Each structure stands twice: as C-alpha cells, then as structure tokens.
C-alpha cells in the first residue's frame, strides 16, 4: 500500500500477472465439498 | 443573581433527562410498539430535555 506505479508496461505486466493467476486457481467454497487439490509447494515457481 | 439562578434552574427542573426508571419503562412500550405497530422509533414523544457533555455543548 506504499508504492505507486509510473510505467505502463510495469502496470500491464502486473495486471496481466493477476488475470492469468485468477484463471489458474480454484477457490474452495465456504459451504463444503471442495476435494483435495494436490497443493503446489511454490507459487512463484509456476509463474516465472 | 439569586433570583436569576432560581428562575434559571426552575426552567431546568421542567426539562430533565430521562433516568433509568423511565428509560426501562419505555422500552416495554417501545418493544410493544415494535411488536405490534413496528414503529420506527416515533411512538414516543419528542425529547425536549437539557443536554450534557463538554465535548457535546461545544
């Protein structure tokens, strides 16, 4: 919450880094079910 | 002056903030108004009592 952005390609990279991430994860519903998802130990490794 | 102070507080005696005695008794009717009329806190008459608080009066 304490850094501002001044480059478009840096903003584009970070915005693209969130759109791709949200499409590659599943959020387990609060209700129930949600079977095991074979967790991956590292998140930064999957996104170089 | 003594006369002014007596007259001033005599007006105050006619306008007193609600104590726990009346504060308890209203909520029965207020809940009864809620239970029966479902009023939006308007069944009771408008307050005209004196105010309190140094951070309030300022």
């Amino acid at each position: 919450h304490r850094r501002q952005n001044r480059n478009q390609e840096i903003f584009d990279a970070n915005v693209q880094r969130l759109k791709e991430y949200q499409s590659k994860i599943i959020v387990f519903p609060r209700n129930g079910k949600a079977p095991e998802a074979e967790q991956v130990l590292s998140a930064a490794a999957t996104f170089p | 002056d003594r006369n002014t102070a007596a007259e001033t507080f005599k007006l105050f005696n006619k306008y007193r903030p609600e104590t726990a005695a009346e504060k308890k008794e209203r909520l029965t009717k207020e809940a009864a108004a809620v239970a029966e009329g479902k009023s939006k806190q308007d069944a009771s008459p408008k307050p005209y009592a004196v105010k309190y608080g140094l951070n309030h009066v300022v």
Partner: protein, 203 residues
C-alpha cells in the same frame, strides 16, 4: 469538538493566560510530595491521545524530578584514570528526566504498568511530569481486548527497559541513515557487526 481547543491553547505556553496558571500550578505541586496520586488528569487532551481512556482502571501519578546534570559519584573529585576522563561536574547523563520520572513512579507502584508521560510544569529546581499508568490485574483491562497487550508478561516494567515513547527516543531507535549506530539496539548491532563468523567451508 472541544478537544481541538485545549491542544492549540496549550501550544501557546508563553501566553499571558498560561503564565498565570503555571505559577499557580508549580506552587501547588511543590507543597505536595515528590510522588503522589494525581486524582484527575490536568491535561485531558494530551492523555486521551497518548492511550489514556477515562474509564475504570486507569490512575495518574504526579512526580517532581530534580533538575540539572549528573555529577559523578567519585569521591573528592578523584577519577584515577588517564587525563582524558578527568571531568566530574560537566557530564550530562544519557536519559531524559522524563525517563527518570517513569522509573521513580513505576517502581513505587509495582502492581501497575507505565503507559506514557508528558510535561506539565517546571521550575529552576524541578521538572514536573504526570505519568499515566494501567492496571493489568483489574478486570476492566483484563477484558476490553483493545488493551490486552498490557496484561502480557512481556510488558513487565516497560519503562525499566526503555520501551516507552521517551525510552525509544532516549536510546534513539528510528528508521533512517541518521540512525545507524542505534537502529536495532546499540549493543546488538555492535555485536552483529563486530564478530568473526566462520563457516564450515572456508571460502
């Protein structure tokens, strides 16, 4: 909004209105004991913004701290050393009188915890402070989890270890290149930077 007025009015300490009060207050404090119970906070605006809450459990004490410098306790002025540290009368001590105010008050009542302090008055001989303390064994502070941290044992005698506002300033712990000697503890930074670290595999 009656608290913005006491702040700005108190900021004009040299005003004629304040000069009358301070002379009256200093006489009242002097005739009392060095440390005694402060029944009501004389500066509600200052205490309120320092963490004090005017509710059940909080108490105030008033303390008079002797004014001046720290003369060495050496006998007859002899220092028995190199001609470098031969001075006795012109040493200035390393903590503010505010820190001593907490120490002498936080030690008289051990059942309490020192929260903060502030300047109230002063004269040629003394510096007056009023210290706000909390009681962690009181059920009011035990509940109302906003102030549960004062009940933790790790906050035992906070001012004795210099963890208060004046404590963090007297020992000078702050962010910035202006504070590199003391940024994470003067001794700890020294030991961290003055030591020989030998690994298993000497590169």
């Amino acid at each position: 909004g009656a608290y913005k007025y006491l702040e700005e009015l108190q900021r004009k300490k040299q005003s004629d209105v304040l000069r009358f009060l301070q002379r009256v207050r200093v006489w009242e404090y002097r005739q009392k004991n060095v440390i005694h119970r402060a029944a009501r906070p004389t500066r509600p605006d200052k205490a309120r913004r320092l963490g004090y809450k005017a509710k059940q459990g909080f108490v105030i004490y008033r303390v008079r701290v002797r004014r001046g410098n720290r003369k060495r306790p050496v006998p007859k002025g002899a220092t028995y050393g190199k001609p470098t540290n031969q001075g006795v009368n012109e040493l200035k001590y390393q903590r503010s009188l505010r820190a001593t105010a907490e120490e002498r008050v936080g030690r008289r009542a051990a059942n309490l915890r020192v929260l903060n302090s502030y300047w109230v008055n002063q004269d040629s001989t003394y510096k007056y402070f009023e210290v706000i303390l909390v009681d962690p064994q009181h059920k009011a502070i035990r509940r109302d989890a906003r102030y549960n941290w004062i009940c933790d044992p790790v906050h035992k005698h906070r001012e004795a270890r210099g963890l208060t506002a004046t404590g963090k300033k007297s020992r000078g712990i702050n962010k910035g290149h202006k504070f590199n000697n003391t940024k994470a503890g003067r001794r700890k930074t020294w030991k961290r930077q003055n030591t020989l670290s030998l690994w298993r595999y000497r590169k």
